[PDB]
Symmetry: D2
Subunit: 370 residues, 4 copies
């Protein structure tokens, strides 16, 4: 019982996406088949398209999907046709990390999210000529009008929420907001600095406001992002080309910030931000540089300051509870991540990729045809 | 009401200590005057003697004192003459860090512990000719037969404990044991690696056994320290000159250790030990290199592993509760830190310094004359 | 160097306060002398006036003072004349609980706050005829135009804050807000119910909104308090005379609330509220019934639900950091506790007491003459 | 592909078990078929046999199984034939509680553990005449020579461990040890009291010793259990018929215990034990009285003491990590729970039930025939 889809396909390293007819098989096991309404586009999709992470091509990418369950496998227990879902990253659900509530550190994370196929090497998508299309990208491959996900990464959300907006809660927004709320455990009355005011950093700024922080510092080089950060809840905005960011943060906070989040991936920014921590302060790291990149820290500064540096994957959340919390906060007017979004038709995916790379659009969302 | 003391005096950078008569004034305010029974000697005393940290000379050092309260200032509330006390580091007791239970990060730490005088620039000790001797070293200057401490760093311990053994609980042993129990929060069933098997590292090994760790790895280059570590509770001992320590720890733990403590101060050891962390593992840092020393970490390894690096001062404990817990564990036969100790008369301080520097003695304790 | 004050004096059990001239001595030790601008009035003052807690009479009560430091004792380290301070409860600062950052559980709490005199049995206030007036009430006795406090319960606040509003941050508002932020650790996306919408409960409602709770339920019997609670950040208001509160909370939250705070002191309300907890939910208890009062719980409900019941004193905060956080949140427009307040001249203290007892005024603040 | 088993069957309320031939079907889905070596017997089995919890009869009970995987369903990912497993309680693995690492509070706990059948109402066991035998008891029904369990409650353990001893780690021993290590988070230097010295209480005593507690108090009425508790790591033993337990604990601990665990299920013991808590102390509750049973607490004592009361199910652990930690501690000589055990052949199940009820045997283990 296969069915026709329209998909954006990456066929060559660094080449534009092609919009193509394809076919997807029926769900098996505890998979759900999702009619995809809209999917966020991320720099991470483009990094895979460029083969810096060489997921085998031709491939259907996309890892910020939102849609409606159309069919369920025989093992699905908790989703039903008609449910609205946000598609998040894959996890195995049975390893020690998954079992402890930390699926972000699943032993099988890279196989399930970057493998290009299921554990048997099979794909669920075929192209117009019947050839396999590498898929299972973040256990969803949601750059297509239909997607398969496992029940545990298809997150039910209230039907009254505006579904086409919600796909980026499956990755980038959960990463920034979860880094603040869960990993760093930012709380009432603390100071927080976001190094980077892209979609992840803005999500962190907004999350720190929700969590009760009284000083919320956005650091970037783009004046319009700094202006937007102030509108989204930051108390201070620092242009790092114009001041010494370490000295500036020390002035604002009286000696250094309680919590910081590095989302640029630039090791010089990371090394500098660690110096901006205050007594017992904690830097969380979510931006990834090229493999092999090192950062340095001053040992005595870390020691005498009681400083912490912590790596964070995907916001280290429990998505099935955390994504609906973010939806509710948004519905309450407390989490305006719609301000990060521009919508595009799937057909315009290459323009959205360009706008993502140029920074003109913090979070493109592609609307799928049906 | 001044009184005569015998003191070890550092008069010149890098020069041997001289044993000299001196005089100490009566306690004021909330000071207690302590008849010092025995004091640990630390590399940190020798680093100050060598003026790498230039506490003004001539100075009376010593920061691991144990003794009997002989007199109290008029503001002392909770100590009385005859009480047995361990002398720990100074803290102001009124800053935000002190008020939160984290005196190790007191805003006034360096003034109170390394200033060489009280806040008015006055010393409580004078030499035989009546000249000031810089003092207040770790709020005690316990290389002398009598010492002044404030009530909040004179820690009451049970009179049935063997008092002459207990002074090192005021610094090095509390640092290693507190790093494990408090900062890292090592708990039942976890894996722990000590990088360094000096007095601090051995204390950490013993503390990890108390706290319930099931894999306890001692890393050093001295075979006799590794042999001793196995006797004191380590499950594994690694000679880092003989194996790749990162690979060896990964083998023992199935991928990396939950908790690690760096006490050598060697930045290459620190950078290497951070690589040995397992998923969501935490490296604690207590060994201090020369100021300005940097260490590096692989950003993606820290990020993808959810690794934490944390600086730790003095074991980040509450000494008035933690030191008596360590005494009780010792009395119960569960904390054999006596195995680190060799006793020397104060007159032999320079031989104890030599044995500390050569590594022949993990923890010299100097017995004071009276 | 004594000085004249105007004080409200409780001379007889249950009798109206009398406004009287008095004299206060100069500060000693680490006391500060505060020119009191305005002081909150609490039911707790009236309970002592009524001698249910028999603080010896004649007595000057008041434990929510705000004012300006006028003089300091010779041991004061961190306050200076001209500083704006909120006066909170007394703690000894040297016991194990104080040393761990939990002065709310100070071993000397009742002596320091309810003793009626200092530890030597001496009062700092004398009446017009020169007789002692029992004082040191919550280490302040701030129903007077001047008050003595110790440095550790005189909390510096920014001079730009409206000082006359801030005294209730020293007790009732810190109790409600700290119970939520610190003891219960309410966090983003959780559900919270306040049993009681007096000043403490309203503070808890406002604090839960600051901390990120997405369901915030106010429970009371007074329609105007429920209406006000919705304006101050509650998502739901329940009149417990009109619905079954347990069933109603279960409906709103899908099975029970994550966090609850009991501030009425009514044991039937407490026992009922514990039933309203959801899976792994926690009830915090701040309202005190008469001594000897018991509450009951269903053992299997607590066991099978993983429920927690926790007693909370004074919001279990670190006041010197927490009170300035609440001031900053108020200045940012995020903590509108001014909506609880009505101002009265000290001369009208008995009318404010009446309005407190009748519930007409949630938090009277008395303005002091000078 | 069904296969023959020998099973202990409960056919009538309160009646002796009957040993009977039966047949079990092949595993499906993510089930594993286990050749059961030995199974603990619990009062909880007898409570179901007596129909106080009316699991439908005829039924095969047993919920402390240990055995060897003989066959796997097609969805099993992480177990293979030949693996040694301890069988613990069932959880769904996909609800919010499971997803957060708290399967003890699974939304489906009672269906999965007390339903008497799978979710379709089907049993996997049939008796000699072919009639259904109610099963799936704690997702195992391990009073039989073969058992079906789901992969997520079949916990792999090292093959070198003595397998026949390990079944009680699947319930009673994990409950006592996990209550101490996980729920209460007993840590180095704390005081702990076990109310009850049955198998659960003894496990808690042993776990508190592992976790570093320096005062470990066993409370019971049976002198031989108190004597055994001292041998297994308790520092103090209290016969509650001979002293006032509250006063005695207050004397031993200097005012009350940091942590307590109630395992008798007697509400008078619970209410009394809550009074024995010290400042900021926590009582954990694992013993279950009859449904509808209430306990009381003094509100002011709980409030002024900052006391906590917490319900605990199954030790609130992650069994796949916690059970192997307990096995390792046992192999290291640090967890001597073999001292609780007496072995019996399955044929003697009714004598083991009698010895359990009389208290003569703390933890019977039944050896299965094959
Ligand atoms: Zn996994
Ligand atoms: Zn301080
Ligand atoms: Zn105190
Ligand atoms: Zn579940």
């Amino acid at each position: 019982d296969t069915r026709a889809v329209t998909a954006a396909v990456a066929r060559a390293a660094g080449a534009p996406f092609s919009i193509e007819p394809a076919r997807i098989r029926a769900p098996r096991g505890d998979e759900v088949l999702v009619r995809v309404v809209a999917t966020g586009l991320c720099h991470t999709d483009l990094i895979v398209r460029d083969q810096y992470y060489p997921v085998p091509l031709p491939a259907v990418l996309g890892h910020e999907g939102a849609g409606v369950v159309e069919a369920v496998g025989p093992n699905v227990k908790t989703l039903a046709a008609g449910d609205h879902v946000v598609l998040t990253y894959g996890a195995c659900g049975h390893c020690a990390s998954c079992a402890g509530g930390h699926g972000a550190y699943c032993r099988q994370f890279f196989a399930l999210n970057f493998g290009g196929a299921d554990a048997d090497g099979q794909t669920a998508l075929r192209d117009a000529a019947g050839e396999p299309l590498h898929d299972h990208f973040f256990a969803q491959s949601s750059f297509a009008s239909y997607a398969l996900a496992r029940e545990n990464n298809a997150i039910k959300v209230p039907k009254e929420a505006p579904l086409e907006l919600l796909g980026p809660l499956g990755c980038g927004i959960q990463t920034g907001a979860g880094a603040v709320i869960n990993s760093l455990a930012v709380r009432t009355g603390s100071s927080f600095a976001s190094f980077g005011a892209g979609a992840v950093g803005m999500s962190a700024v907004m999350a720190a406001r929700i969590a009760g922080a009284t000083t919320i510092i956005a650091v970037d080089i783009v004046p319009s992002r700094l202006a937007l950060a102030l509108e989204l809840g930051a108390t201070h905005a620092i242009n790092s080309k114009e001041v010494d960011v370490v000295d500036a943060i020390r002035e604002i906070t009286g000696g250094g910030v309680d919590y910081a989040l590095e989302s640029t991936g630039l090791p010089a920014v990371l090394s500098q931000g660690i110096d901006a921590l205050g007594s017992r302060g904690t830097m969380g790291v979510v931006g990834a540089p090229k493999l092999g990149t090192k950062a340095e820290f001053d040992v005595n500064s870390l020691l005498l300051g009681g400083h912490t540096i912590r790596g964070i994957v995907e916001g280290d959340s429990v998505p099935q509870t955390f994504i609906p919390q973010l939806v509710q906060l948004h519905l309450q007017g407390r989490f305006p991540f719609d301000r990060l979004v521009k919508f595009y038709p799937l057909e315009q995916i290459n323009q959205a990729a360009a706008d993502s790379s140029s920074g003109i659009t913090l979070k493109p969302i592609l609307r799928l045809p049906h």
